[PDB]
Scaffold this active site. Structure first.
Site, short mmCIF file in Angstrom:
data_model
loop_
_atom_site.label_atom_id
_atom_site.label_comp_id
_atom_site.label_asym_id
_atom_site.label_seq_id
_atom_site.Cartn_x
_atom_site.Cartn_y
_atom_site.Cartn_z
CG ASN A 57 -37.45 10.40 3.60
OD1 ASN A 57 -37.72 9.42 4.13
ND2 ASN A 57 -37.22 11.56 4.18
CG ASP B 205 -31.41 13.71 14.13
OD1 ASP B 205 -31.69 15.10 13.56
OD2 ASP B 205 -31.96 12.80 13.61
CB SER C 289 -36.19 10.55 9.76
OG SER C 289 -35.22 11.26 8.98
CG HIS D 22 -34.83 15.53 11.89
ND1 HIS D 22 -33.71 14.73 12.03
CD2 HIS D 22 -35.57 15.01 10.81
CE1 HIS D 22 -33.86 13.66 11.07
NE2 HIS D 22 -35.04 13.47 10.38
C1 LIG Z 1 -40.53 15.76 12.66
C2 LIG Z 1 -39.78 16.16 11.27
C3 LIG Z 1 -39.39 17.38 11.00
C4 LIG Z 1 -38.70 17.82 9.95
C5 LIG Z 1 -38.55 16.96 8.95
C6 LIG Z 1 -37.78 17.14 7.67
C7 LIG Z 1 -38.07 18.37 7.19
C8 LIG Z 1 -37.59 18.78 5.91
C9 LIG Z 1 -36.80 17.76 5.16
C10 LIG Z 1 -35.87 18.07 3.80
C11 LIG Z 1 -36.39 16.62 5.75
N1 LIG Z 1 -36.83 16.26 6.90
N2 LIG Z 1 -38.90 15.40 9.11
C12 LIG Z 1 -39.35 15.36 10.41
#
Ligand SMILES: *Cc1ccc(-c2ccc(C)cn2)nc1
Ligand SMILES: [Ca+2]
Length: 269
Positions: free
Chosen positions: A153, A32, A215, A62
């Site tokens: 997603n 990640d 995720s 993330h």
């Molecule tokens: C906890 C968290 C933070 C950010 C994201 C994220 C943001 C933007 C994109 C395009 C994909 N995922 N997910 C979860």
């Protein structure tokens, strides 16, 4: 005070914990954006494959969030992971922007197979196949790693790569009603689902945050795999994957849900 995020309870991790199953002795790599030092995480090691980010600390957020769903520590603070005693490894394959390459991801998978990981969590994906990535998924699998990957997603009825590959365990997201989250990709290759809406976890700055995504679903399954491995140390990646599927709760549609909702109580009984 510690609180238990709803998804941790939904996958029935506390029942496993009460049997003494915590993921102790199981090595779980989070491929990640890194994992930041946090009072509710115990990061054992790791490596970075992102040029210009030689540290495994998380400049995005993330990866730290994903890590806490797997393994936030069981104590008097913060939250609680599915496998709170898992041996966590920060394998940085995505930069602070959240982007990486198929090569970086492949290098993280090679690292996992060369370093004795039992589980690799890949909360990442793309709509297109990659020979580089597939080779690395297959190699890690041949080295005993259970590769667990997010379905994506986009809301579509086909799933992202590498989740789509046979040697990845593909995870979609459910909501509090045990319905598929609107964004959760589904279809051929989907193995299982887990909570992915309003998931609270660890976050950089020594805090906690809530997020939505496949995720967030993926690490529930990575953690459940670690519980199964602690219960059954002799088992292979394939045996663990099959057992998680066989003990999942049907949600009424294989297309949408694969085997259904992961169930750590049933998987460790
Ligand atoms: C906890 C968290 C933070 C950010 C994201 C994220 C943001 C933007 C994109 C395009 C994909 N995922 N997910 C979860
Ligand atoms: Ca905690």
């Amino acid at each position: 005070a510690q609180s238990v995020p709803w998804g941790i309870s939904r996958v029935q991790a506390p029942a496993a914990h009460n049997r003494g199953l915590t993921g102790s002795g199981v090595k779980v790599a989070v491929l990640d954006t890194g994992i930041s030092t946090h009072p509710d995480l115990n990061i054992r090691g790791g490596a970075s494959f992102v040029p210009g980010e030689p540290s495994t600390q998380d400049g995005n957020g993330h990866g730290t969030h994903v890590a806490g769903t797997i393994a936030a520590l069981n104590n008097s603070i913060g939250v609680l992971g599915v496998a709170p005693s898992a041996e966590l490894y920060a394998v940085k394959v995505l930069g602070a922007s959240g982007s990486g390459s198929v090569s970086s991801i492949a290098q993280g998978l090679e690292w996992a197979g060369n370093n004795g990981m039992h589980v690799a969590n890949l909360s990442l994906g793309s709509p297109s196949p990659s020979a580089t990535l597939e080779q690395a998924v297959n190699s890690a699998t041949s080295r005993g790693v259970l590769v667990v990957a997010a379905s994506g997603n986009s809301g579509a009825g086909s799933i992202s790569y590498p989740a789509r590959y046979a040697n990845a365990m593909a995870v979609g997201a459910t909501d509090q009603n045990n319905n598929r989250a609107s964004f959760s990709q589904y279809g051929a290759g989907l193995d299982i689902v887990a909570p992915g809406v309003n998931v609270q976890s660890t976050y950089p700055g020594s805090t906690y945050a809530s997020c939505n995504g496949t995720s967030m679903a993926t690490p529930h399954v990575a953690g459940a795999a670690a519980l199964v491995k602690q219960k059954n140390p002799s088992w292979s990646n394939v045996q663990i994957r099959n057992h998680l599927k066989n003990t999942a709760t049907s949600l009424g549609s294989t297309n949408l849900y694969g085997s259904g909702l992961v169930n750590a109580e049933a998987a460790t009984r």
